[PDB]
């Protein structure tokens, strides 16, 4: 474990109320939006001052609230953990609610195609093991339809739309443990058919160790995972490169701009008096092979 990263961080989220951040995006004005257990926050991209809040009490909230930038709108979710109802909102960039709806269950991931088709990973229902990728269109953002059910003992974890007709999903064995099998699978969205599957569990190049988020990058994608590694892949799943590496277990969602990842980070670090604390922050890293290890020396 490392020291609290006051010198390196872009934005200290814990004092702003954005406790346990899970996802972060740039909007079309390059302002920053964070989805956290403490709610949804908008920050000015230049000054980092708070511009808008939809605050929540972080101890009651489910993990993996989502935030997606889509044209001139923000799409975001929250759920109270014990209720297992997800609130889906579409807002203007100034925070005006233009759509609200409710989804039975909890989510792990959400993505949207350029043409506006939304895809979610529904968490497995209590007493079930399999889970589901569902879809509906932003035009009428209700009436979710099944695109795929996981195979028994497996679960979808994260998804990413690679184009209007293509999606990638990460999979792990369910129930999941630190030695659990993992892979990436690819779907054809015109017909909801699996077209490929690559990778496997591990921390060697080309292997995945529990992806936190999958970002579209060129025609392919970059994902991070619990080992701290950012791994780039082609559209067909061919491994390309380790683009960066941070400490393990801190990173959740991230966005990419100008060859740099904007990271949501939360987890254990050592405060100035060597005390263990759970901190929340944003931090950028260049996707040129940079690493927190190297930065150290």
Q: Identify the helix (H) or strand (E) that includes residue 296.
A: helix 292-296
d(CA 287, CA 242): 9
Instruction: DSSP for 234-271, please give it.
Output: -TT--EEEEEEE--TT-EEEEEEETTEEEEEEEEEEE-
Resolution in A: 1.6
Locate 132 and state its tokens. Answer: 């589901």
Q: 166-173 and 290-291: which strand pairing?
A: unpaired
Query: How far does Cα 184 stand from its chain's mean position?
Result: 16
C-alpha 166: how far from its chain's center?
A: 18
Q: Is-contact 264 254, C-beta < 8 A? A: yes
Q: Supply 54's token pair.
A: 């939809």
Vertex 202: Cα angle to 253 and 233 (nearest 5):
55
Q: How was this structure determined?
A: X-ray
Q: Is the peptide bond before 175 cis (omega within 30 degrees of 0)?
A: yes
Under DSSP, the state recorded for 265 is: E
DSSP, res 244: E
Q: Are 132 and 117 in contact (CB under 8 A)?
A: no
Q: Where are the domains of the chain?
A: 17-251
CA distance 182 to 176: 10
- State how beta strands 239-245 and 67-70 pair: unpaired
Q: CA-CA distance, 93 to 28, in Å (whole number)?
A: 9
Residue 34's Cα: distance from chain center in Å? 11
Residue 232's contacts (CB-CB under 8 Å, 6 or more residues apart) are: 217, 220, 221, 222, 239, 240, 241, 242, 243, 287
DSSP string, 115-145: T-EEEEEEPPPTT----EEEEEETTS--S-E
Q: Which residues of 259-277 are buried (b: 16+ CB within 10 A; e: fewer)?
A: ebbbbbbbbebeeeeeeee
Whole-number Å distance between alpha carbons of 221 and 128: 31
Asked if 244 contacts 289 with a C-beta cutoff of 8 angstroms, the reply is: yes
Closest by CA to 34, choosing from 61, 73, 65, is 65
CA-based nearest residue to 134, from 124, 123, 149, 119:
119
Contact 91, 74 (CB under 8 A): yes
Three-state DSSP class for residue 14: helix
Spatial contact of 109 and 158, defined as CB atoms under 8 Å apart = yes
Q: Among the CATH numbers 3.30.70.20, 2.120.10.30, 3.20.20.70, 1.10.645.10, which is that of 17-251? A: 2.120.10.30
């Amino acid at each position: 474990m490392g020291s609290q990263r006051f010198d390196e961080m872009l934005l200290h989220l814990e004092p702003r109320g954005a406790r346990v951040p899970y996802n972060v995006v740039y909007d079309q004005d390059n302002n920053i939006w964070v989805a956290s257990k403490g709610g949804l926050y908008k920050f000015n991209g230049k000054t980092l001052r708070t511009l808008h809040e939809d605050k929540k009490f972080f101890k009651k909230m489910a993990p993996f609230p989502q935030v997606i930038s889509y044209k001139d709108r923000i799409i975001y979710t929250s759920a109270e953990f014990s209720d297992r109802t997800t609130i889906l909102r579409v807002i203007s960039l100034d925070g005006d609610v233009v759509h609200e709806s409710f989804i039975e269950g909890l989510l792990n991931s959400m993505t949207i195609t350029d043409s506006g088709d939304m895809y979610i990973v529904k968490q497995a229902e209590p007493g079930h093991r399999n889970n589901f990728i569902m879809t509906t269109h932003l035009d009428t953002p209700i009436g979710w339809d099944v695109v795929a059910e996981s195979k028994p003992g497996e679960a979808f974890s994260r998804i990413c739309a690679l184009d209007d007709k293509t999606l990638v999903a990460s999979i792990n064995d369910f129930p999941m443990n630190m030695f659990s099998k993992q892979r990436l699978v690819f779907y054809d969205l015109e017909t909801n058919t699996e077209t490929g599957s690559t990778s496997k569990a591990g921390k060697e190049p080309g292997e995945i160790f529990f992806p936190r988020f999958i970002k579209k990058y060129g025609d392919g994608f970059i994902l991070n995972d619990k080992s701290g590694r950012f791994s780039e892949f082609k559209k067909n799943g061919e491994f390309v490169a380790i683009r960066a590496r941070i400490d393990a277990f801190l990173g959740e969602g991230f966005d990419v701009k100008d060859g740099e990842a904007l990271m949501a980070l939360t987890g254990m670090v050592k405060d100035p008096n060597e005390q263990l604390i759970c901190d929340d922050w944003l931090e950028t890293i260049k996707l040129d092979g940079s690493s927190w290890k190297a930065d150290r020396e």
